[PDB]
Amino acid sequence: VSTLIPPKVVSSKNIGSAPNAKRIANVVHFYKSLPQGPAPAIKANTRLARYKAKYFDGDNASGKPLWHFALGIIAFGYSMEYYFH
Amino acid sequence: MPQLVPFYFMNQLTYGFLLMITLLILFSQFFLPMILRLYVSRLFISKL
């Protein structure tokens, strides 16, 4: 008989609920959390970003840069021994 | 030799106390809060 039934006026399940707080958070916070970032530095001809590219990539964890840096200093004081004497 | 047997202690000590103050400020203001920044950024993402 009756045509009076809940769905005609719904006006508070079409609004309220807790995940809205999370929703509005991640449209503002995460749209500017760019997918690749702003492409962070790791190379360039600044004469020391090139150093970073061969040795200090976040991938490298090999003993090669350590050795490379060490060998210069061995040559430094030994030559300087002959520069002072 | 004199360079490997310094008696240059006052000259040296000037350079010594300067280096400590330089590193102290440098860490404190630049590199240390940038490490807490990494932690916090990861954690704030963790929150959302």
Q: Which of A22, A26, A84 sits opposite B3 (nearest CB)?
A: A84
Chain A residue closest in CA terms to B2:
A84
- A54's CB contacts (< 8 A; 6+ apart) are A65
CB B48, CB A25: distance < 8 Å = yes
d(CA A26, CA A24): 6
In angstroms, how far is CA B10 from the centroid of its own chain?
22
* A32 shares contact with chain B (CB less than 8 Å): no
Interchain pair B48, A85: CB under 8 A: no
Resolution in A: 6.3
Q: Which of A29, A84, A85 sits opposite B48 (nearest CB)?
A: A29
Determined by cryo-EM
- B2's CB contacts (< 8 A; 6+ apart) are B8
Buried-exposed string A15-40: b where 16+ CB fall within 10 A, e elsewhere: eeeeeeeeeeeeeeeeeeeeeeeeee
